[PDB]
């Protein structure tokens, strides 16, 4: 397969469907390079478990956490480093109000090369455990020889895009990062990527980040085809934001508009979230304890209620990972019966404005409050006009794009809800014989 999309192993399923997911000591294994050092972007950590997890010959290596903690949680974090004399931190600047440092990636410095991964797990033992998550691997980038001098630079641009990311955090650890990057060959790279950082880009900056980055890929390196009003919009997260009052606030009006781009030349798109109902986390592998990492509170539900006639549920017979709660997060364009899509995303972001941006000062201004990176796949970048979709995840052509849950998906029935995570349940026990009561 050309597309090195995985998904995380899930603990209690049969063999068959982890046979091609990863765990973290595969991704860290020896058998992917001879470690020097390593970054772990992050948002939550459990660094006792993380070292854990490197191999023990590579244990002592430098590490550098990357976090948006402050005040007492950043000395918590400090403090649960404190025992590793290798390992460094780096405090993301959040000088917007509300963000939060949520981008997943690893960057892994080996003997031969380097590695990026850009996932969607926390570096804690439960978000590897019985969830579903999405994975990116990059190829191995060799080293440009020293004295050569090439750009080392992809058709995607991902070499220059990943520099431009990093140089947003204006950080003296990320510069040694930068400057590796600078030194290895990324041409490989048949993805794009898709970044948030913090701040109010107007101008030549508007279409750097969030929507509008996602907007202006796809109007440069998609085709619009006919029929195209047909061609569903999915979006497919863990947590839910502030939308506004209606639709026309921000959902339909900017983000829709963003993700059904294609092509060049200047609505009745359906829109299909999927998002885990009650009856979802209450028989998940988990259990009530799933909705631990679902975060969508009563007091934003109850402003929102007509979101909530668009949610579907959580199904991925497919993958065999229906009881195993997503805490991946993905974007796609399928066709009208779903057989196709004109792309796909993963990313850390959820569905919401910190995330993606909201347009500010009559339109002129894009505001983003976290960071956030993602991957896309377009049928361009692979010499193709679509991508078919895989009929089983785990199945045996290489050009049919593994789309890890269900299609099409299932609307919510009547008696359905969505997880809220504050409020109890207390009519049905879960999967452990327990009520949830926060
Ligand atoms: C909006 N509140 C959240 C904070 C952290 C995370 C995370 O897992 O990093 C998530 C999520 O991804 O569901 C939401």
Not at 291 to 307: D, H, M, R, V
Not at 418 to 431: L, R
Request: net charge positive; aromatic share 12%.
């Amino acid at each position: 397969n050309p597309f090195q999309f995985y998904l995380t192993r899930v603990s209690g399923v049969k063999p068959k469907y982890n046979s091609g997911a990863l765990h973290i000591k595969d991704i860290l294994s020896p058998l992917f390079g001879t470690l020097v050092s390593s970054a772990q972007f992050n948002y939550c950590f459990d660094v006792d478990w993380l070292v854990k997890q490197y191999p023990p010959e590579f244990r002592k290596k430098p590490i550098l956490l990357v976090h948006g903690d402050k005040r007492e949680a950043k000395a918590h974090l400090h403090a649960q480093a404190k025992p590793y004399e290798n390992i460094s931190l780096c405090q993301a600047k959040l000088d917007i109000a509300f963000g939060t440092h949520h981008t997943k990636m690893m960057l892994l410095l080996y003997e031969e090369g380097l590695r990026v991964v850009i996932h969607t797990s926390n570096l804690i033992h439960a978000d590897w455990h019985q969830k579903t998550q999405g994975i990116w691997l990059s190829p191995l980038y060799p080293r440009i020889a020293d004295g050569t001098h090439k750009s080392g630079e992809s058709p995607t641009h991902f070499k220059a895009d990943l520099i431009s990311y990093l140089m947003a955090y204006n950080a003296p650890s990320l510069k040694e990062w930068i400057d590796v990057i600078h030194k290895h060959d990324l041409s490989e790279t048949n993805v794009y990527l898709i970044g948030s950082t913090p701040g109010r880009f107007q101008g030549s900056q508007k279409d750097n980040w969030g929507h509008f980055r996602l907007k202006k890929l796809l109007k440069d390196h998609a085709s619009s085809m006919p029929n195209a009003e047909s061609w569903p919009v999915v979006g497919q997260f863990s947590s839910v934001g502030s939308l506004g009052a209606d639709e026309s606030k921000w959902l339909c009006s900017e983000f829709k508009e963003s993700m059904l781009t294609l092509g060049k030349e200047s609505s009745s798109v359906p829109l299909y979230l999927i998002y885990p109902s009650v009856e979802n986390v209450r028989t998940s592998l988990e259990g009530y304890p799933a909705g631990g990492s679902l975060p969508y509170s009563i007091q934003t539900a109850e402003k929102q209620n007509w979101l909530h006639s668009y949610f579907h549920k959580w199904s991925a017979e497919t993958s065999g990972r229906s009881n195993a709660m997503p805490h991946i997060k993905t974007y796609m364009r399928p066709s009208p019966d779903f057989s196709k899509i004109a792309w796909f995303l993963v990313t850390s972001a959820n569905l919401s404005k910190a995330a993606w941006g909201a347009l500010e000062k009559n339109g002129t201004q894009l505001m983003i409050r976290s960071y956030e990176l993602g991957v896309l796949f377009l049928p361009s970048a692979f010499g193709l006009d679509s991508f078919k979709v895989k009929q089983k995840f785990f199945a045996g052509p290489m050009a049919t794009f593994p789309v890890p849950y269900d299609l099409p998906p299932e609307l919510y029935g009547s008696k359905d809800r969505p997880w809220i995570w504050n409020i109890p349940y207390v009519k049905a026990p879960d999967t452990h014989g327990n009520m949830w009561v926060p």
